[PDB]
């Protein structure tokens, strides 16, 4: 996408499109993500709270994964995705990161 900026309070969603560490659909890979990867998005020009600026994000529950052991003689784990709890949104992952 080659598109002019899209400022929304304190985020550039164009930079969210161009991001590579924050477009995962797992809740854990965004919750455990880095501040360097989030510092790409910030473009404020005068807000006063992160909670007021993060309103322009998703409130739907993400599809995270839960790995269980298999109980076999070559023992291993089998991971898979799964809808999380009402709290496992995208805004909550960004707030925990912050």
Partner 1 sequence: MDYQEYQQFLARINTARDACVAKDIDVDLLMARHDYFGRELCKSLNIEYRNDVPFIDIILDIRPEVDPLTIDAPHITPDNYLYINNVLYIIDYKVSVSNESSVITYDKYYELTRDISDRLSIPIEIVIIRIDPVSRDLHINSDRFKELYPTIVVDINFNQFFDLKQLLYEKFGDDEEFLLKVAHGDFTLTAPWCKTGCPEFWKHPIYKEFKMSMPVPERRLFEESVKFNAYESERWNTNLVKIREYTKKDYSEHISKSAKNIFLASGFYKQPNKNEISEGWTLMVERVQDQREISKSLHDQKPSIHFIWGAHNPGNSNNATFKLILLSKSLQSIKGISTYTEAFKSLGKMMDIGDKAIEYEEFCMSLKSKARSSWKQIMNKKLEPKQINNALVLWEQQFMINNDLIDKSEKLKLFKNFCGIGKSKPKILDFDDANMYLASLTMMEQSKKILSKSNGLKPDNFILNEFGSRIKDANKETYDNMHKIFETGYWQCISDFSTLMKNILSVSQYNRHNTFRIAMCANNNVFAIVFPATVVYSIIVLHKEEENIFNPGCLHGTFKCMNGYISISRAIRLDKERCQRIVSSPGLFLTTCLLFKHDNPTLVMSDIMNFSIYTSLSITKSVLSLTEPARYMIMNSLAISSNVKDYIAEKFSPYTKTLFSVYMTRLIKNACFDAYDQRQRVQLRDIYLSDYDITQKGIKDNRELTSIWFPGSVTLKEYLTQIYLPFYFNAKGLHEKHHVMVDLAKTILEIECEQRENIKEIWSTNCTKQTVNLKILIHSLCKNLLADTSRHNHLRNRIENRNNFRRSITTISTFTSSKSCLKIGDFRKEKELQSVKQKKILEVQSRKNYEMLRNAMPNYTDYISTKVFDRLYELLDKKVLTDKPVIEQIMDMMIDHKKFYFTFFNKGQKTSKDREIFVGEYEAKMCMYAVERIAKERCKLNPDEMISEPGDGKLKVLEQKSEQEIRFLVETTRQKNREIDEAIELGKIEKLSLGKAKGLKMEINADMSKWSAQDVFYKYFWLIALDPILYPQEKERILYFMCNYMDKELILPDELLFNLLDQKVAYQNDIIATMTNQLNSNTVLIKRNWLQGNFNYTSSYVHSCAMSVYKEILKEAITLLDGSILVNSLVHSDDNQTSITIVQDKMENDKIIDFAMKEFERACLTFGCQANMKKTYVTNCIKEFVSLFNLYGEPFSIYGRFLLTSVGDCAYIGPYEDLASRISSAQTAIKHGCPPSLAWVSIAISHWMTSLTYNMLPGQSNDPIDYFPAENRKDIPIELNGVLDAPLSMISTVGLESGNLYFLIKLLSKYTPVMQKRESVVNQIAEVKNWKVEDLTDNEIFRLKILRYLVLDAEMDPSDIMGETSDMRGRSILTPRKFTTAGSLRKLYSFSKYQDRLSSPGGMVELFTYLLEKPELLVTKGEDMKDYMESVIFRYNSKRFKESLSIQNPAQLFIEQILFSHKPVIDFSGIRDKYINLGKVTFTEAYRLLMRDLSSLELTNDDIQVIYSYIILNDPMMITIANTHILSIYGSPQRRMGMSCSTMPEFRNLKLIHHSPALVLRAYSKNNPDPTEMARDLVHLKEFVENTNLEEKMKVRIAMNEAEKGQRDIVFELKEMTRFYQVCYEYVKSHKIKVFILPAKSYTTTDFCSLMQGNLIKDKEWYTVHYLKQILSGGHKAIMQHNATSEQNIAFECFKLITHFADSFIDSLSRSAFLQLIIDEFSYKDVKVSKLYDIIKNGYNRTDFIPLLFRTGDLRQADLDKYDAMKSHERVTWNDWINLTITGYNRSITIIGEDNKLTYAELCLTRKTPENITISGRKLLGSRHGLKFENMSKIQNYYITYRKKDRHQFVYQIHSHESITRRNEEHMAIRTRIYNEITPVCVVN
Mark the binding-site residues, compressed into ranges.
44
Please tell me whether residue 43 binds partner 1 under the rule CB under 8 A: no
Residue of 91, 7, 82, 87 lying closest to 57 (CA atoms) = 91
Residue from 16, 43, 50, 97 that binds partner 1 (CB under 8 A)?
16
User: Which residues, 6+ apart, have CB-to-CB distance to 51 below 8 Å?
Assistant: 95
Please tell me whether residue 66 binds partner 1 under the rule CB under 8 A: no
The H-or-E segment that residue 15 falls in is: helix 13-17
Residue from 42, 44, 66, 80 that binds partner 1 (CB under 8 A)?
80
Please tell me whether residue 44 binds Zn ion under the rule CB under 5 A: yes
Cβ–Cβ < 8 Å for 52, 9? yes
Site residues (CB under 8 A) for partner 1? 1-4, 6, 13, 16-17, 20, 23, 25, 55-60, 67, 70-80, 90-91
């Amino acid at each position: 996408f080659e598109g002019p900026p899209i400022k929304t309070g304190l985020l550039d969603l164009t930079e969210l499109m161009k991001s590579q560490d924050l477009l995962n659909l797992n809740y854990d890979n965004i919750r455990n993500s880095n501040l360097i990867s989030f510092s790409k998005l910030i473009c404020c020009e005068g807000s006063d709270n992160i909670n007021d600026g993060l309103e322009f994000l998703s409130d739907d529950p993400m599809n995270f994964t839960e790995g269980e052991a298999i109980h076999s003689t070559p023992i291993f784990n089998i991971y898979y995705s799964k809808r999380g709890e009402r709290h496992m949104t995208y805004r909550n992952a960004i707030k925990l990161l912050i």
